[PDB]
A paper describes a structure:
Reverse transcriptases (RTs) use their DNA polymerase and RNase H activities to catalyze the conversion of single-stranded RNA to double-stranded DNA (dsDNA), a crucial process for the replication of retroviruses. Reverse transcriptases have two activities: DNA polymerase (POL) synthesizes DNA on DNA or RNA templates, whereas RNase H (RH) degrades the RNA strand of RNA/DNA hybrid intermediates. The structural and biophysical experiments showed that MFV PR-RT is a monomer upon binding to RNA/DNA and a dimer when it interacts with dsDNA.
The second crystal form was obtained using a deletion variant of MFV PR-RT that lacked the RH domain (MFV PR-RT ΔRH) and was grown in the presence of 13-bp dsDNA with a 5′ overhang of 2 nt in one strand (substrate 2) (see Materials and Methods for the sequence). Unexpectedly, the complete model of MFV PR-RT ΔRH revealed a dimer of the protein that interacted with the dsDNA duplex. One subunit that we termed subunit A adopts a structure that is analogous to the monomeric form that is observed in the full-length MFV PR-RT hybrid complex structure (RMSD of 2.6 Å over 477 Cα atoms), with small differences in the positions of the individual (sub)domains. However, the conformation of the other subunit (subunit B) is markedly different. This conformation is very similar to the ones that were observed for the p51 subunit of HIV-1 RT and subunit B of Ty3 RT, with the largest differences in the positioning of the thumb subdomain. Interestingly, they interact with each other. However, the dimeric arrangement of the PR domains in our structure is markedly different from the architecture of stand-alone PRs such as the HIV-1 enzyme and would not allow active-site formation. In the PR-RT ΔRH structure, protein-dsDNA interactions are observed along almost the entire length of the nucleic acid, and these contacts are mostly mediated by subunit A of the dimer.
Residue numbers in the entry:
A (entry chain A): 5 to 51, 53 to 571
B (entry chain B): 3 to 37, 61 to 71, 73 to 227, 243 to 365, 378 to 475, 478 to 578
DNA sequence: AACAGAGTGCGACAC
DNA sequence: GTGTCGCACTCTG
């Protein structure tokens, strides 16, 4: 199974894709630049442009052929099937077929559109039936040149395979046989060999990931920075109708060069196999994959893609359906497929990257709220760091989070070894955290076209910070700073100022080039510049940071006569 | 009428940039491969030799199917309307003005007719990875969505010319966008973490011709490209040329034009501008053709919009190129009081200061209230204190071995800088604020007087380190700023970042000499 | 016995 | 003191 056909043009060799939807064979423009056009016809593209028809001879699979071609936007050949009536690809048969008709039916009934709009929806999914995952372990075929992932200078030491869990050996076995049939795996001896280590899932199945740490040591990390879960969450748009589309087995769609394949080798039940697409557990497999998908969809407005999960939102369902179809088409020509089960399209609210995007705003999921009620008091340091780490996820949703978490954070230094000094008063602290997070509010998004309002204030012990959009009533996020020992000795103004400094470090990124406005209990900034030196208790290096903000043009300050306290 | 362009090549599973020269029928390729048959643009054919650089020369006789086309970007500037403006702005005699128009039109290949158009120097490419330890890759935050299509069009244009290519690198530099005056945005590359790992490298008729994006005309070697990488729309983009914001890119840029024009006397280039002056209009036009020819042959392109010529007045280095201390008397006690503070530094290095300064103290005390009476004799006793300080009073000569300390400050209408040597100063400075500068904020006033104090500083330094002392604070914070709070900077602080990234000069704030109300200099 | 990003705090050592 | 940079844990795909 090639699923890409060797095509030879002008004594050169490209790849030809057999497109049923191709009314005409296209061809890269570099080959038609010397030929004479024979006709002009409107040609269907993603963005129906009028192209010119040619007459060219070439050969596919080695057999001479010839017909009417046209210029292609890509470096590969789109093939009208009528141009090669002798060739016919066979269908696709793996192990377990999925209930794709059930996936569609489920996805429509959950859709928040009307019955007339629901019909428009139902037609669209039956139309792109070729786009949805139809078998277990079905992989797409990305039409990009293969990656050379073996960018190393020193060779890695081969690993002896260690123990595979017996409970996983049937699950991997089907995957390997399913991946072998689609050409993803190849039986091949190799210099390198790495251990296959399945990771569990909530369902009885198991994942194909491998201990690639030895290989990872000899390969440099790709420096691209295209995963920012917070930046997406804080900057996505939240109109009426929202939807998420989950790519399926995205790694296994990116081809890797043959010379780069040996580094992926692993041993399974006696024989040594070699990956052909980006394997899982490899250090550059994320950065390479997520680069391609985020590059593909950049021009789709209002979109947000995290690795293989795609969110967007519009106000009217009519536009949502147009953009949705545009997305499906871009994925299909690219060679990607979509898991319909993992995705949900058209709802007043949907959960994205661990938060629920309700019609009112970004909030904590019910699934998370159950996660935190169901914790017991910790017994070891690792347990303390897990309860702390889970709590930390929700930090932005309560005005004074950094207070109630401090008594728990302090317990890890006083603890010696893994044993910890938990008290009845300590458990009480744990309960207060959960109740505030239980009753925690709903968070706003960042208006990328409006100034950033940052309202700050401080008490003798800690300093509080809330962010808003100019005139916005619900905050984007909460923050607060516990004054350390050295900060406590500061004058009340210097406490306000070290609170402001810790805000602006964050608020500079939050503005996205917009202006910034500061509301504070400080009457005038100019009197602060001339505060007597025998009055300022903090060091001079802390006062150059604070005074520098008065010189930044992107920020102005304001006095707000609201909520003083001490 | 835009000019020709290069073509992508690839030989033996190796990606390379390729260039077309009409002359040679012998292609040449880097020798490292040759321990014949290869593809260019996708089509493949076979007669080569070795090349001087990592670049490839193609034989045009080898690829008949390829006929180059005029250069096409996204936005075409009105080249003729720029040409007529420089004609109409030329305060020169009319028949000569028409003759210059004829010369300007003759070189439609030197001017830029395309937004974000780049040139190309046939110089050997620059090895800019001259550090020893690699910079730590840097993280990136989400970009303002309104800023993306502006930057995307700029990147799309740079990709089509081959300036930017999509390549994965080990390193990564942040990118932050900033508003332009119009509705578009501008891309900034925050190369500080990169910069810290690499070693640092007049008459009647006047004119200023300004090269356009000269940085992007300098090829950089292939093994030095990885360090320039930034991540746009989730893919890493690598520069094939000197990037804006790199350390040694301004130095390597202007060092090329001064040597291009080394044989022409009287030139004065600064970063991106070119300065020439002549006695007549006949000589002025003869040098234009001489200078324009060198630029074309080398490979730059100049923007007619940003240039000015044949004017009795031009601007250059922030000043006015015209044709070919002291104060004003005080009115209230506040003016006189800020005078005493100005010269309070001099009590240390001047022997007879107490007696000269005694007039001032007596006037402040005798006249109660805010209404001061200052006799016309007091005005003359300041006339001596000015002239006494500048002439020769305890002024040490510049020591070429020691670093230079410069303390600057400004009044509302005038600016006052001074220079020491790591017991008394070297020399003094004075700037009167123009009508545009007079409307600035006191910070902005105190800021132009630093630029000007720094042009003389780099002159009087003779290469030594520099220490700047001003009432500007964020200068010193920007100098040493901890990396958790590094972040992005506002437009004004970028130009001074270029000065700041210099490991030789250091900025300080000392809090001395306030003078909010000092009467201006004499007219 | 896997990967990458985001986030947080702690903590030994630097200066 | 302020500051680096490695570690721990959590979340996301």
């Amino acid at each position: 199974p090639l699923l890409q056909l060797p095509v030879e043009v002008k004594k050169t060799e490209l790849n030809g894709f057999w497109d049923t939807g191709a009314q005409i064979t296209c061809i890269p423009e570099a080959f038609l630049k010397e030929e004479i056009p024979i006709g002009e016809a409107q040609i269907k593209t993603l963005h129906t442009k009028l192209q010119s028809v040619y007459y060219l001879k070439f050969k596919v699979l080695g057999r001479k052929v010839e017909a009417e071609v046209t210029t292609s936007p890509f470096d590969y050949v789109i093939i009208s099937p009528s141009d090669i009536p002798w060739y016919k690809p066979q269908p696709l048969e793996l192990t377990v077929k999925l209930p794709v008709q059930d996936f569609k039916k489920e996805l429509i009934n959950k859709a928040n559109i009307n019955n007339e709009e629901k019909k428009q929806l139902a037609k669209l999914l039956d139309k792109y039936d070729v786009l949805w995952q139809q078998w277990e372990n079905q992989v797409g075929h990305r039409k990009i040149p293969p990656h050379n992932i073996a960018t190393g200078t020193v060779a890695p030491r081969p690993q002896r395979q260690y123990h595979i869990n017996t409970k996983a050996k049937p699950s991997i076995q089907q995957v390997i046989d399913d991946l072998l049939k689609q050409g993803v795996l190849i039986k091949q001896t190799s210099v390198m060999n790495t251990p296959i280590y399945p990771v569990p899932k909530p369902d009885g199945k198991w994942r194909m990931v491998l201990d690639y740490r030895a290989v990872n040591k000899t390969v440099p990390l790709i420096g691209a920075q295209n995963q920012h879960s917070l930046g997406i969450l804080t900057n996505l748009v939240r109109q009426k109708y929202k939807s998420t589309i989950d790519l399926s087995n995205g790694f296994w769609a990116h081809p890797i060069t043959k010379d780069s394949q040996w580094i992926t080798a692993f041993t399974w039940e006696g024989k040594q196999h070699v990956w052909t697409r980006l394997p899982q557990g490899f250090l550059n497999s994320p950065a390479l994959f997520t680069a391609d998908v985020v590059d593909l969809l950049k021009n789709i407005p209002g979109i947000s893609v995290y690795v293989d999960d795609i969110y967007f939102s519009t106000e009217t369902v009519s536009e949502h359906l147009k953009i949705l179809e545009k997305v499906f088409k871009i994925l299909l020509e690219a060679g990607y497929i979509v898991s319909l089960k993992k995705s949900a399209l058209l709802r007043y609210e949907v959960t994205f990257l661990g938060f629920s995007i309700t019609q009112t705003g970004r909030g904590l999921t019910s699934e998370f709220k159950d996660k935190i009620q169901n914790i017991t008091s910790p017994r070891t340091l690792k347990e303390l760091q897990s309860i702390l780490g889970l709590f930390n996820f929700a930090r932005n949703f309560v005005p004074n989070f950094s207070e109630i978490i401090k008594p728990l954070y302090s317990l890890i230094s006083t603890a010696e070894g893994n044993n910890i000094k938990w008290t009845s008063e300590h458990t009480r602290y744990l309960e207060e955290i959960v109740s505030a997070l239980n009753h925690a509010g709903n968070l706003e998004q960042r208006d990328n076209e409006s100034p950033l309002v940052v309202k700050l204030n401080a008490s003798p012990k800690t300093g509080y910070i809330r962010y808003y959009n100019k005139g916005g009533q619900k905050p984007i996020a909460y923050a607060s700073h516990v004054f350390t020992n050295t900060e406590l000795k500061f004058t009340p103004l210097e406490k306000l100022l070290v609170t402001m400094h810790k805000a602006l470090i964050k608020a500079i990124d939050l503005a996205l080039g917009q202006p910034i406005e500061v509301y504070s209990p400080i009457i005038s900034m100019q009197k602060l510049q001339k505060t007597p030196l025998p009055e300022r208790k903090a060091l001079s290096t802390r006062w150059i940071t604070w005074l520098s903000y008065l010189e930044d043009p992107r920020i102005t300050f304001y006095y707000d006569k609201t909520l003083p306290d001490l």
